[PDB]
Design a binder for these strands. Structure first.
Length: 60
DNA sequence: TTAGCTGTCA
DNA sequence: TGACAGCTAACG
C-alpha cells in the first residue's frame, strides 16, 4: 500500500522481466527496503506477474 | 512439503 | 490491488 513500497517493487520487476522470481536473499532484502513482511513481498510478485508481466507477453 | 499459480472477494 | 483458501509440480 505504501507509495514508496510500490516503486521499489516495480523496479526489480522490470529489471528482471525474464526472471521475475527473486531468491530468499532478495525477498528479505526487498522487505527491508520496503518494511513489508515476507508474505507481503511473496504475494505482490505473484500478482504482479499475472497483472504486469504476463499482459505484456500477450502483446509480445 | 514448499514455491508458485489460479480463482476471487472487498 | 492487497488478501488467502485451494490445487499442482519440483520421499528425505
Amino acid at each position: 500500500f505504501p507509495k514508496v513500497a510500490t516503486n521499489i517493487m516495480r523496479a526489480w520487476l522490470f529489471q528482471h522481466l525474464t526472471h521475475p522470481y527473486p531468491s530468499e536473499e532478495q525477498k528479505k532484502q526487498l522487505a527491508q527496503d520496503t518494511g513489508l513482511t515476507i508474505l507481503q513481498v511473496n504475494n505482490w510478485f505473484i500478482n504482479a506477474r499475472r497483472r504486469i508481466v504476463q499482459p505484456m507477453i500477450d502483446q509480445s
